[PDB]
Amino acid sequence: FEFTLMVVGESGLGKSTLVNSLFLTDLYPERIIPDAIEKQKQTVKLEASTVEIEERGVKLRLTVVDTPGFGDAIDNSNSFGAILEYIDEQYERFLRDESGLNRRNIVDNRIHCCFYFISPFGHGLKPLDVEFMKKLHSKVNIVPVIAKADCLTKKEILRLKCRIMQEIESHGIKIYPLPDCDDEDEDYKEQVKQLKEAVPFAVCGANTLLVRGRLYPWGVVEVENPDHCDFIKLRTMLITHMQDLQEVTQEVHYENYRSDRLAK
Amino acid sequence: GFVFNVMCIGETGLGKSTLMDTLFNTSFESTPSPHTLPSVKLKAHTYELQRLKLTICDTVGYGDQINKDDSFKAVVDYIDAQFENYLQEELKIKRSLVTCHDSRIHICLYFICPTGHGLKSLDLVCMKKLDSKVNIIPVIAKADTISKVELQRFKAKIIQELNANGVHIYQFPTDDETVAETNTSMNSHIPFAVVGSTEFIKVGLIRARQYPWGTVQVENETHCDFVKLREMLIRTNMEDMREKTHTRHYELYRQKRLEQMG
Numbered sequence: 001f002e003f004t005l006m007v008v009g010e011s012g013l014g015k016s017t018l019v020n021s022l023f024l025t026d027l028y029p030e031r032i033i034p035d036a037i038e039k040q041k042q043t044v045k046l047e048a049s050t051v052e053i054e055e056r057g058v059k060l061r062l063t064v065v066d067t068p069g070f071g072d073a074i075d076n077s078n079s080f081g082a083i084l085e086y087i088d089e090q091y092e093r094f095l096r097d098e099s100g101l102n103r104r105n106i107v108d109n110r111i112h113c114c115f116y117f118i119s120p121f122g123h124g125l126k127p128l129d130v131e132f133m134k135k136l137h138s139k140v141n142i143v144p145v146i147a148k149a150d151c152l153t154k155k156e157i158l159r160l161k162c163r164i165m166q167e168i169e170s171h172g173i174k175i176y177p178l179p180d181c182d183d184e185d186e187d188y189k190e191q192v193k194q195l196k197e198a199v200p201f202a203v204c205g206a207n208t209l210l211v212r213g214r215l216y217p218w219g220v221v222e223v224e225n226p227d228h229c230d231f232i233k234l235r236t237m238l239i240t241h242m243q244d245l246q247e248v249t250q251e252v253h254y255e256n257y258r259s260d261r262l263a264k
Numbered sequence: 265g266f267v268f269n270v271m272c273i274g275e276t277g278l279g280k281s282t283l284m285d286t287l288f289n290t291s292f293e294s295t296p297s298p299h300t301l302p303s304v305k306l307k308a309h310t311y312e313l314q315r316l317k318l319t320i321c322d323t324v325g326y327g328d329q330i331n332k333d334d335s336f337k338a339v340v341d342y343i344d345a346q347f348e349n350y351l352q353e354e355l356k357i358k359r360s361l362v363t364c365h366d367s368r369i370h371i372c373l374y375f376i377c378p379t380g381h382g383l384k385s386l387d388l389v390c391m392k393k394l395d396s397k398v399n400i401i402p403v404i405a406k407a408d409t410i411s412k413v414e415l416q417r418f419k420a421k422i423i424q425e426l427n428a429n430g431v432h433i434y435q436f437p438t439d440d441e442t443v444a445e446t447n448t449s450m451n452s453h454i455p456f457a458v459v460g461s462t463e464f465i466k467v468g469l470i471r472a473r474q475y476p477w478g479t480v481q482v483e484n485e486t487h488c489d490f491v492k493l494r495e496m497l498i499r500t501n502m503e504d505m506r507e508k509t510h511t512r513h514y515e516l517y518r519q520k521r522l523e524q525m526g
């Protein structure tokens with residue numbers, strides 16, 4: 001494999017903690033966290049970090065492309081301007097290398113999937129969330145993720161899940177769909193059925209072993225436990241859908257960018 | 265009655281109205297606000313409870329626009345409007361200050377998102393525009409989102425960033441030697457990690473939040489600083505807020521207008 005994942009969201013949503021908690025890694029050493037004095041006009045930069053990881057015989061080269069500074073400025077206008085240019089750049093790099101007379105070894109840096117994180121503190125999708133997803137759902141597979149699920153009770157999780165699903169339906173956002181299964185397997189058909197009913201995945205990230213979880217004076221949040229958060233469902237969906245995510249990136253989004261650019 | 269005016273600054277949904285119901289043990293009119301509001305505005309309601317005439321001034325639409333540049337005028341213009349209303353009442357020849365309704369904001373609770381890092385850029389700019397206008401009490405809204413290990417480093421970065429930008433926050437009076445020891449640890453736990461809840465869980469009837477891994481007791485000091493935030497409701501602390509509002513903030517605005525008026 002050679003999979004590329006993009007992470008987008010406000011700072012302080014546990015994104016770095018989540019992407020680390022997936023394959024139990026540490027992609028962000030010496031993480032420079034700026035202060036509020038240098039964040040009012042902090043532009044959105046793109047910093048990639050590729051990591052090797054073997055998952056039950058599935059050895060893959062995971063390249064994570066974070067977008068530090070998204071939605072942390074006073075005026076978040078054109079915050080998603082650099083994210084757009086990078087994705088189209090990777091499509092252009094692939095279009096140049098595929099059209100050239102020497103395509104023996106090509107670096108495939110196209111973004112196959114893009115996690116977008118939603119703050120659980122508010123009531124639903126914010127204008128920054130809507131104007132981002134609508135401006136990128138036709139170029140990359142958007143996967144909505146409710147960050148920091150452990151601040152929402154049972155009733156609050158189902159309330160926020162259903163609302164931001166209506167707002168996605170209302171604004172016409174094309175998030176990444178999970179493919180339907182054919183008879184085939186019965187247990188796998190039940191697993192993919194609960195994945196469709198759990199989206200948007202309200203997840204929790206933690207690197208502390210206690211069996212990963214978070215410690216509170218009133219209790220312990222079990223990350224790997226589905227009854228507490230949808231971490232295991234997001235991780236399971238990622239591994240089982242890396243093929244489809246890669247294929248839809250090539251056969252759909254890339255081909256649409258190709259046809260659009262060939263007329264320019 | 266005791267005219268105490270509170271202003272809740274906080275992003276939409278951070279639990280401003282929930283904490284007010286939790287703190288006064290009642291249920292104020294608390295309709296939610298959507299994230300689709302073109303600009304930050306203020307909604308103020310008046311209530312007569314206990315006996316005091318409470319005025320809660322909430323921030324409607326805060327931190328939702330994509331362009332949050334001009335999201336400070338409506339706050340400052342309101343706080344300056346109440347100062348001008350009190351000042352113009354003084355200038356009146358046949359004035360009635362005893363029956364005049366003092367609508368000046370005495371205390372202002374700032375709800376910080378429980379991100380864990382520090383203050384957003386919106387937080388620093390908003391507090392530096394109001395540090396010379398109102399008594400600012402910063403709190404960490406939805407404090408249960410943060411563990412006690414992270415909460416230690418969080419209050420560290422918050423206090424550090426505030427005292428590095430020269431943001432004048434409110435401190436509780438230590439002049440009285442009796443309240444000296446209690447208001448010492450009181451000021452030492454700012455920002456108050458607060459958790460608001462209107463639901464009750466069986467215990468021996470108690471305000472708490474029910475998670476599948478535990479229950480967060482709002483009135484438990486080891487869970488949250490709500491027990492300490494409730495200390496601002498005593499008569500001496502409320503009087504100190506009104507004292508400082510008129511002695512420092514309003515008198516500053518009064519000396520400004522008297523210069524402009526020549």
Ligand SMILES: Nc1nc2c(ncn2[C@@H]2O[C@H](COP(=O)(O)OP(=O)(O)OP(=O)(O)O)[C@@H](O)[C@H]2O)c(=O)[nH]1
Binds near residue numbers: 151152296
């Ligand atoms: N994790 C956590 N959730 C809370 C807490 N307090 C309230 N909530 C939840 O978040 C929601 C907050 O609602 P409000 O208090 O009305 O939000 P608000 O601050 O008034 O924002 P506006 O509606 O725009 O005025 C509630 O419905 C609760 O379910 C808290 O202390 N911790």
Ligand SMILES: Nc1nc2c(ncn2[C@@H]2O[C@H](COP(=O)(O)OP(=O)(O)O)[C@@H](O)[C@H]2O)c(=O)[nH]1
Binds near residue numbers: 013379380408
């Ligand atoms: N309550 C809660 N806190 C979390 C979770 N994940 C991470 N955190 C805390 O959030 C803080 C910062 O998270 P971080 O990943 O650096 O934020 P981000 O990288 O900007 O998205 C850390 O100190 C974590 O302890 C979660 O699922 N729930």
Ligand SMILES: [Mg+2]
Binds near residue numbers: 295297
């Ligand atoms: Mg409210």
